[PDB]
Write a protein that binds this DNA or RNA. Structure first.
Lengths: 110, 380, 184, 183, 196
RNA sequence: CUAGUAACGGCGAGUGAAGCGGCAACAGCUCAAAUUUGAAAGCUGGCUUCGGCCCGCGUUGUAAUUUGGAGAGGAUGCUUU
RNA sequence: GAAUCAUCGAAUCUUUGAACGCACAUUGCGCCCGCCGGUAUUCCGGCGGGCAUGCCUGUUCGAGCGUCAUUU
């Protein structure tokens, strides 16, 4: 009835199943509105776009002069000759955190 | 003839404010917010906010009656009261000075810092939220994007190094599922990072893997809210990864060596046992990544397309082909610098991504080193 | 207000350390280690509040002042006796490739103009050093795993790593490589 | 043996240490309710001697009763009036016994031991499971406590002839005309 | 002005009455407890002789049971319980006795300082019956005692026995016999002058 | 049955027992006051595959031993489950 | 397997009444949870389970310079 003794260091040595085991189709209720997925990555998101997609240096300066969150696009394309010249994205985590409040703090309208 | 009030009848019965929902649930505001992430509760918009509440503002958020009633009957709400009393019991033995009673009560707590497995069990909530495996793959889009982003980020109080070590272990396990089934189709290079598209059961999954560098995290970010997102997605990851391995017949969880993982094998330590156009691309080819090229995004791609023999530098990893560059077995070396053996083709990692996207063997003469690269295109 | 409880303890720790420090100089400063040059990642842990003056000069020499910092050193017959003085406040051990590559990637800070900036661009690397044979972070990563002559500047470039405090996770040979994983 | 010391101290109750305690407690008990509750007995030696245990199902209640006459005298004792007022308050419990705790010029203060017949610790214990039986409902109302046995004259001897089995039963026996068949 | 709750006022008025009324020497000696240094040194020794809790006693019995399937000395713990402790001090088995100052029926400990002084065991009076229950692994302990310690710290108890004697016992010697009271404030002094 | 006796009384009216003896029926016990102190050994819950887990009560005392025509402790050797 | 049959271990059991959401001389007036029908996420009607007081044990929440510890 009773397990014998194991010393507590050996207890620290000591310390998956199918969710859809019986799966049936379920009709979705019309009130629940699913979240809209993110757009697919466009041509201009690439680190080496065609040179017709270059803006010149004036609106790069004009981009940095005006305040953030006043932009139609949070990005403009850049040119990089090699992947080692490409740095990490500066505001990636802030964008994903803004997606979090887009996912659970900003409402959906059907 | 009966008199009925406009305040008590109408949209006020249907929609309820956030403050009224919190007071009804008798929970704290972070507790109510966390339960909304797990259960998928959503504020939505009423048709007329004035009809819902006469004293109301557009900045205020409302809620539906039915999903609030689900939160009232949530077993997690019962589990929150049990965990709160248990957290009071942890400070009991600390206050008494009872070290042994503190050791066992934290062991009864099963706190996630020392375990890595999430604190609460949400198998029933995930089952209620996702009715089909296709919807799990649809939410795997943001799940894998969350997983690889927060696997690159360092450890904090909300996300300890144990949970990232579990995250990078399970992310490679899902990657090992992809390289067995050859599921990856499109790879995309971008300033934000590297995008990947793979097809599973007729469903496409997109995720973004930033470059392995130092990403600044400072500002106003809540580590608790990204922590509960990871905890929800980690539980969704484990049951999906168990389903996919049992679907293909490979055993789950796969075995691994801690010595190889500590020595830097990464993708090489994870050995997968079968029993408890993509393949034709580099069907019989040898690859050698140099020290500059990113090993982790490259190794994911060519193993997904079934290339057999790949090596890299000793300082880049462990458990690979021979490190020395004098071996003539290698055909294509991936170099990116600003030997020169005639038997070895010298080519750039940009050629790798273009050849995966086009699947037409783009010429290495055009992608020769020391020359300006052609503009690559987005497959989407 | 501070009690005579702490006064006697502080003077007892000071005479114990002075005897041990004067033990060390009077005896031969030789460690039971092979003469082959090796590499140490060394971490300051708070030993005692008061500090003696010979380690005062040498802890400023390792710029190891703040709580729970780390830095990479290379052992010589000199650097051993530097390590063989500062034992109670530091932990010394041989790193592994996974431990070192993560630590700079998760936390990489550089020193220019007396400023602690992150490691955001490899173009910043060439703007900082440039002409020392280094080409990116992985060049510095390889420089850590096998010591070259330019490691002296790479140690000087690299800021001390301000690691996070663990919640409970002299010489330790592999236990410090367990300590980096517990507290990074 | 701390309760032997308490027994000797309770005997000496006009002395300086105890009269101080009886003064400060009477002030506190006066400003509390009439039929308030006590978490622990104020006289643990008297509670122990009378049957109180530190077990779930045993509670203590404190009662203040007005002192004086009813020159008609109320034949019910002030302890019997105290016991009747707890039972009408704690109607789910059974009055075990009671004891004196304090005095004033206007009030007398008693502490009453109650036993819960519906707890499981009480029904399991054969030393107190007798009070679980339905004969012992409201013992204080029938004169079945130590106060009631005193006021009913339930002693033995020539001195207690009229009341040693109940005076109403004895008066019925002594006033009955017994007629037999073969008279 | 505002109205306080009834139990708040009653427990606050119990403060003023205790400090105003002059107290007989049996209860007045409980107002003189020991100092911060002697408490920490006493509890340093006493923590070393804590009893075993329900968890590590159940594991220790599980030790000897599974070994019997497949040699001990006398345990030394701090002694507690009133009738157990006063039985020990009546039999001169106790070395040091530590008494709480806040036993709600004070009579349960009011004979203890005289009984310890008659029998010859040195005693002390400490703040907190909750602090003694911490040592005991109970909620509250009215009194604790030490009978015998291991030979590792026979010297530590002897120095604590002396430190309790010359630091607490020969300082309250005159205040054992003398009454309490005499903490009258400015409002009480003006009221007494008006009454007289 | 004692006994309309003793005893009490505008000693008028009156009131009014009991021990003994013969029967009927019979049956004895539990605490508090003790230090288990070489080990709170006691008990309520609610979680369970039910086999045994935690929470609380409780040392200001829950079990065992003992209740003054007794008893405890040692020793002692038979007899009981 | 009849019965204005007997037995009786399973059910049903309207309003009241110690009478228990409020009122009562009206088949009325409120709140929490769920369901159904009729234009129906908003309107109406109906139905189901609940909502008295004193006290006991536990659970949980709160207050009190009542009160203890907290520089190793």
């Amino acid at each position: 009835r009773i397990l014998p003794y194991k010393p507590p260091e050996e207890r620290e040595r000591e310390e998956f199943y199918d969710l859809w085991q019986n799966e049936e189709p379920q009709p979705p209720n019309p009130m629940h509105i699913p979240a809209p997925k993110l757009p697919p990555p466009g041509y201009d998101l690439s680190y080496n776009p065609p040179p017709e997609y270059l803006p010149t240096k004036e609106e790069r300066e004009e981009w940095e002069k005006m305040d953030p969150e006043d932009r139609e696009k949070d990005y403009l394309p850049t040119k990089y000759d090699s992947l080692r010249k490409v740095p990490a994205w500066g505001n990636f985590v802030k964008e994903r955190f803004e997606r979090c409040m887009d996912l659970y703090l900003a409402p959906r309208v059907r | 003839g009966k008199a009925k009030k406009k305040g008590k009848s109408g949209a006020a019965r249907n929609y309820m404010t956030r403050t009224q929902a919190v007071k009804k649930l008798q929970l704290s505001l972070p507790d109510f917010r966390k339960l909304c992430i797990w259960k998928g509760i959503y504020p939505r918009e009423p048709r007329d906010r004035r009809k819902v509440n006469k004293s109301a503002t557009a900045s205020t958020t409302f809620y539906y009656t039915k999903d609030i009633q689900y939160l009232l009957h949530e077993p997690l709400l019962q589990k929150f009261r049990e965990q709160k009393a248990l957290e009071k019991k942890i400070s009991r033995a600390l206050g008494r000075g009872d070290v042994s009673n503190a050791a066992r009560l934290e062991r009864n707590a099963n706190l996630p810092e020392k375990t890595g497995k999430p604190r609460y069990t949400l198998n029933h909530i995930i089952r209620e939220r996702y009715p089909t495996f296709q919807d799990a793959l649809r939410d795997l889009d943001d799940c894998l994007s969350m997983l690889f982003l927060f696997a690159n980020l360092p450890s904090t109080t909300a996300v300890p190094a144990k949970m990232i070590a579990r995250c990078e272990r399970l992310c490679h396990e899902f990657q090992h599922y992809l390289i067995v089934t050859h599921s990856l189709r499109k790879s995309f290079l971008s300033i934000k990072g590297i995008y990947y598209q793979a097809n599973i059961q007729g469903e496409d999954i997109l995720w973004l893997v930033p470059y392995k560098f130092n990403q600044r995290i400072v500002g106003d970010v809540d580590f608790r809210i990204m922590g509960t997102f990871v905890e929800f997605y980690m539980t969704l990851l484990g049951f999906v990864n168990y389903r996919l391995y049992t679907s293909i017949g490979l055993k789950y969880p796969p075995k691994f060596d801690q010595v190889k993982d500590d020595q830097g094998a990464e993708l090489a330590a994870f050995s997968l046992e079968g029993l408890n156009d993509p393949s034709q691309l580099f069907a019989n080819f040898t690859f050698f990544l140099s020290r500059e090229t990113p090993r982790q995004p490259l190794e994911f791609i060519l193993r997904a397309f079934g290339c057999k023999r790949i090596g890299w530098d000793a300082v880049l990893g462990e458990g690979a082909f021979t490190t020395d560059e004098s071996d003539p077995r290698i055909t294509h070396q991936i170099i990116d610098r600003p030997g020169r053996y005639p038997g070895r083709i010298y080519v750039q990692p940009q050629w790798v991504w273009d050849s995966i996207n086009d699947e037409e063997l783009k010429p290495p003469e055009l992608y020769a080193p020391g020359a300006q690269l052609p503009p690559h295109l987005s497959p989407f | 207000f501070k009690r005579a409880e702490k006064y006697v303890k502080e003077y007892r720790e000071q005479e114990r350390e002075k005897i041990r420090l004067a033990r060390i100089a009077k005896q031969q400063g030789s460690f039971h280690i092979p003469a082959e040059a090796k590499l140490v990642f060394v971490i300051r842990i708070k030993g005692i509040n008061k500090i003696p003056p010979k380690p005062r000069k040498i802890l400023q020499l390792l710029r190891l002042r703040q709580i729970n910092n780390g830095v990479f050193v290379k052992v010589t017959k000199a650097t051993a006796e530097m390590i063989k003085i500062v034992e109670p406040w530091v932990a010394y051990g041989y790193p592994n490739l996974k431990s070192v590559r993560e630590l700079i990637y998760k936390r990489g800070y550089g020193k220019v103009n007396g400023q602690r900036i992150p490691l955001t661009d490899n173009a910043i690397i060439e703007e900082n050093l440039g002409k020392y044979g280094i080409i990116c972070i992985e060049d510095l990563i390889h420089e850590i795993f096998t010591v070259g002559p330019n490691f002296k500047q790479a140690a000087n470039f690299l800021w001390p790593f301000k690691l996070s405090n663990p919640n409970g996770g002299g010489n330790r040979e592999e236990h410090i490589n367990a300590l980096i994983r517990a507290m990074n | 043996g701390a309760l032997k010391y308490l027994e000797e101290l309770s005997k000496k109750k006009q002395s300086d240490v105890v009269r101080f305690l009886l003064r400060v407690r009477c002030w506190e008990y006066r400003q509390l309710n009439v039929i308030h509750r006590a978490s622990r007995p104020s006289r643990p030696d008297k509670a122990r001697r009378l049957g109180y245990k530190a077990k779930q199902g045993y509670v203590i209640y404190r009662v203040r009763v007005r002192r004086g006459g009813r020159q008609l005298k109320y034949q019910r004792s002030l302890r019997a009036t105290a016991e009747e007022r707890v039972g009408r308050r704690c109607s789910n419990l059974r009055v075990l016994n009671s004891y004196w705790v304090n005095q004033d010029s206007t009030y007398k203060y008693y502490e009453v031991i109650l036993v819960d017949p519906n707890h499981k610790a009480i029904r399991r214990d054969p030393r107190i499971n007798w009070i679980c039986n339905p004969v012992h409902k409201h013992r204080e109302c029938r004169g079945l406590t130590s106060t009631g046995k005193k006021s009913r004259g339930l002693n033995k001897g020539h001195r207690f002839n009229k009341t040693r089995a109940g005076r109403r039963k004895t008066w019925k026996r002594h006033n009955t005309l017994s007629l037999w068949r073969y008279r | 002005m505002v109205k306080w709750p009834e139990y708040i006022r009653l427990q606050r008025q119990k403060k003023i009455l205790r400090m105003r009324l002059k107290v007989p020497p049996a209860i007045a000696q409980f107002q003189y407890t020991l100092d911060k240094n002697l408490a920490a040194q006493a509890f340093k020794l006493l923590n070393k002789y804590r009893p075993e809790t329900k968890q590590e006693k159940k594991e220790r019995l599980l030790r000897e049971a599974t070994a019997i399937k497949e040699v001990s000395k006398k345990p030394y713990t701090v002694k507690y319980g009133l009738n157990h402790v006063v039985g020990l001090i009546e039999n001169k088995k106790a070395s040091l006795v530590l008494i709480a100052n806040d036993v709600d029926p004070i009579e349960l400990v009011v004979f203890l300082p005289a009984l310890c002084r008659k029998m010859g065991i040195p005693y002390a009076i400490i703040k907190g019956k909750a602090r003694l229950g911490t040592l005991v692994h109970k909620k509250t302990a009215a009194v604790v005692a030490i009978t015998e310690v291991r030979s590792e710290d026979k010297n530590e108890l002897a120095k604590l026995i002396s430190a309790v004697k010359e630091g607490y016992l020969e300082k309250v010697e005159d205040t054992r016999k003398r009454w309490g009271g005499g903490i009258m404030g400015f409002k009480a002094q003006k009221r007494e002058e008006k009454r007289k």
